[PDB]
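Reopening: Kelch-like ECH-associated protein 1 still failing for me.
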Amino acid sequence: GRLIYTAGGYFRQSLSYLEAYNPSDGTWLRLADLQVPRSGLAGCVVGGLLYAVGGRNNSPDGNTDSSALDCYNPMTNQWSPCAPMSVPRNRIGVGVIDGHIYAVGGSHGCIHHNSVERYEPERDEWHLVAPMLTRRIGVGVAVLNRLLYAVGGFDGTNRLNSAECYYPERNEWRMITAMNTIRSGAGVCVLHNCIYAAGGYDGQDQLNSVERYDVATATWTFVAPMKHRRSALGITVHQGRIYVLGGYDGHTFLDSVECYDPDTDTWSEVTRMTSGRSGVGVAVT
Ligand SMILES: COc1ccc(S(=O)(=O)Nc2ccc(N(CC(=O)O)S(=O)(=O)c3ccc(OC)cc3)c3ccccc23)cc1
Ligand code: NA
Ligand code: NA
Ligand code: NA
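Support: Ran it again with your exact input. Result attached.
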């Protein structure tokens, strides 16, 4: 009975919503709002708790990048503040290794970060780790074999098809094979020993293409495309299928949730979000 949690996001302004989808019964729960609205954040789970990391509050009253880390306990339906990151990071990527949260890249105003930092929930402290080899905002992150992959993004000048791999024990990054497509604001996840990158923006158009990196072969291969082009989408994996949530298609904030079945190489529409939004954080617990 694990749920897909969606936190924050944007429609007209940054949002405070926390909602959870159950693929088993098709239900949505409306859970406790975030304390502060944010879009461009990332979600992750450590030890059955949901963490909302970074992002930005884009409001009619002003725009504020976030260094916040907040923790949601499903058992109490309550958000609790944690230690903030060293710097604000909007359009952040996040991955977890061995119970530690990595905050990768993102922007603070015009600064497009190459820096990376690591949170230890048991000490409630962040520290810097090695910087990525490239500045990346709108970067997607996934973890496989206790290595962390940072995929695509924007460096402040160029939208990127490159990607790189972090080695936590050695504390170093290495460039991996570049993707077939330039993608910022893609959904990036791990499924069956491959890193998937779904959708995003190539500098000109929102994308419906999906490609996956087979780590063993160092090769990116396209799979079936999504039905809807989308950037700033949420993504996650639940019971061996990919779910993509919302995003912007170039004209509309989407409420569409599509599900990828690797066995048949097919996408299908599985539910709608309660309202269209982009820039959400997503995780499963
Ligand atoms: C036209 O030029 C571009 C088009 C698309 C892109 S991208 O999708 O690749 N990168 C992203 C852009 C914006 C984000 N958000 C808000 C912000 O950072 O200011 S959002 O989801 O909150 C949002 C707000 C307003 C929007 O209007 C249409 C669209 C998205 C992003 C949030 C997370 C990840 C990437 C984001 C970049 C440039
Ligand atoms: Na610190
Ligand atoms: Na993720
Ligand atoms: Na609706």
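The chain has one domain: 1-285. If you still see a failure, please send the error message rather than a screenshot.
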